[PDB]
Amino acid sequence: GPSVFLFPPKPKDTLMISRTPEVTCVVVDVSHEDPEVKFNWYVDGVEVHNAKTKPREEQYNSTYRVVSVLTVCHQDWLNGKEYKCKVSNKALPAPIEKTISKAKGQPREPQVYTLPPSRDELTKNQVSLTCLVKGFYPSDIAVEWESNGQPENNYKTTPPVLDSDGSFFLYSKLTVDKSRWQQGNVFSCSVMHEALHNHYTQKSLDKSTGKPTLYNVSLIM
Amino acid sequence: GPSVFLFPPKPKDTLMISRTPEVTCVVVDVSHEDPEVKFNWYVDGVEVHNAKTKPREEQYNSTYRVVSVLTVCHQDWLNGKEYKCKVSNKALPAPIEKTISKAKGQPREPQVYTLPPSRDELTKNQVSLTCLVKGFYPSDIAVEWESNGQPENNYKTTPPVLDSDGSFFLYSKLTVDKSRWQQGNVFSCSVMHEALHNHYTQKSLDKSTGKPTLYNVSLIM
Amino acid sequence: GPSVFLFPPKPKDTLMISRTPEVTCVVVDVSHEDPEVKFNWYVDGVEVHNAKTKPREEQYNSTYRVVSVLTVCHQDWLNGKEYKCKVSNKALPAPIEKTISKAKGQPREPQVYTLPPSRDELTKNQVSLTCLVKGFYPSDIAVEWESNGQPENNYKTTPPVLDSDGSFFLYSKLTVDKSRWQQGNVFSCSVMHEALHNHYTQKSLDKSTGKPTLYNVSLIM
Ligand SMILES: *[C@@H]1O[C@H](CO)[C@@H](O)[C@H](O)[C@H]1NC(C)=O
Ligand SMILES: *[C@@H]1O[C@H](CO)[C@@H](O)[C@H](O)[C@H]1NC(C)=O
Ligand SMILES: *[C@@H]1O[C@H](CO)[C@@H](O)[C@H](O)[C@H]1NC(C)=O
Secondary structure, eight states: OOEEOOBOOOHHHHTOSSSOOEEEEEEESBOSSOOOBOOEEEETTEEEOOOEEOOOOOOTTSOBOOEEEEEOOHHHHHHTOOEEEEBOBSSSSSOBOOEEOOOOSOOBOOEEEEEOOOGGGGGSSEEEEEEEEEEEBSSOEEEEEEETTEEEOSEEEOOOEEOTTSOEEEOEEEEEEHHHHHTTOOEEEEEEETTSGGGOEEEEEOSSTTTTSSOOOOOOO | OOEEOOBOOOHHHHHOTTSOOEEEEEEEEEOTTSOOOEEEEEETTEEEOOOEEOOOOOOTTSOEEEEEEEEOOHHHHHHTOOEEEEEEOSSOSSOEEEEEOOOOSOOOOOEEEEEOOOTTGGGSSEEEEEEEEEEESSSOOOOEEEETTEEOOSEEEOOOEEOTTSOEEEOEEEEEEHHHHHHTOOEEEEEOOTTSGGGOEEEEEOSSSSTTTSSOOOEEO | OOEEEEEOOOHHHHHSSSSOOEEEEEEEEEOSSSOOOOEEEEESSOBOOOOEEOOOEEOSSSOEEEEEEEEOOHHHHHTTOOEEEEEOOTTOSSOEEEEEOOOOOOOBOOEEEEEOOOGGGGGSSEEEEEEEEEEEBSSOOEEEEEETTEEOOSEEEOOOEEOTTSOEEEOEEEEEEHHHHHTTOOOEEEEEOTTSGGGOEEEOOOTTSSSOSOOOOOEEO
């Protein structure tokens, strides 16, 4: 019958209280002869009926795609609860199940450092801001830029990369224009990792004197 | 017959991911003729079975006390979903039902400040550290002190007090010995309020009353 | 069967000469059949005819209530003179005598330390100062605020909180226009308590009480 996948929740959703995390069981390549799609979610051997069933979606190759969204709770996912998606279908001869949980590795606290642009790139119209996040295990991590408490969109982030000690490390290149950088604006890097206390951290990068790299102080003594 | 209370979960438990939030409903004044009690837990009317009942405690007034604890979800409680501990017992002509939820309102974020001890304080055996938490809403915060990631215990916190502009504020004195203070220990105060980003903030305090304020700024370049 | 309540004066009144401490005796449950009441007092067994009685009041319970007020010189209350409230009511099988005097406990002098506001608040248009009080027994104390001999009213005080050593401690944040604090206006926190010398003390504040005078500045490069 139709293939059934599994989607883990975004680690940013799982590590943030304000965000709702979801465990997703998607079905792909479903024919029109079998529109009946059923799910049975078992958490640690306990069936849960709280799942929400999204509408089916038709692709260009005339296949349905029914999305099974289950609202997961952060304490559950972080503590090691197994989530079983038992789907019984007409086109499937037998029920299909897939097991998903969290990575049961040894947590390692990320170290976050922010680096100002070097003077080489101070000639262009847009400077690059670097957020080094090294020494964290595992790769379930997310990073974004915030300026004066509001989100920043013009940035990218390299995927985590294996290191010498077996941990991971990744970067985040924030492209702001030269003027806003040169006004002394405060840019902050936000990193959410399971090993971090409160699953959050922040580093600030001022223009001249907050981080001493170029020095000119009107000291108030 | 018996009577039923309702304990909201601690704000420290609710606003911290690693902690376990729970709604405790307490039944006291239970006679010997009806010692067995049934707990039906509802979250917006939906029954749950994950509540862990507790052994009876025989009170000195010739009665019992049986308590059932439901571990709530952080998203569920902090959103404002209702919680009803329905207690069924033979003695009660009508089973007791009470409902508790998060205090609805406009959550104004706190503005944490920290105040180093006055100069007159450093002439005593122990100093006191002030962590002002002003202008928040509502009055559900637990404040704890930390030192280099270690917990602090010798501190007290004033109950939240009203503020002229309708908000709240509160205080916390950290009693530490003067010697550790005078070395240059990095003491920090930890707040957890629902209106913050990640519902957590930490304010640093060190020997200097700010960088350009105290005895000398030994510039090293 | 009337009941004779008795209430001490507010401690703020008793500690300070200008305000008037008073003996507030209440006769409650005064039936309408025998509503006429006679008031008597003893000062260590001596009748005094210098008191005044507030007029009769009506309540929602179809009963009567009266309150009488006797002027007390602060010395008599301070050294524990005995005040007894006698009521000669016609609905009484016997006169009721209630004895009130100074609530004698051990005294410990409050140690008033005032703390300047932190620079983090200095960005706001309002600034909150602090007058910590600690190590005093018992918890009956009034803290006021003044500047240039003129009292301020934009202040709030937290209720006393028990300390580790059995004493108490409390705080008093007062908010001012930032500019008013910026020219180094003085701000004295008055503390009135029995254990203090003269039942009164004060500690001042100034833009330069957090900014010292010694500056051993060093430039090592
Ligand atoms: C340093 O900053 C001061 C701020 O008053 C400014 O006037 C001065 O030109 C600056 N000097 C530099 C950038 O060399
Ligand atoms: C000034 O700073 C230096 C840094 O080397 C320190 O040794 C010295 O004690 C400071 N001065 C005072 C008066 O504390
Ligand atoms: C002031 O700083 C100088 C330079 O470091 C040092 O030699 C001197 O002892 C300091 N004065 C003090 C600590 O009183």
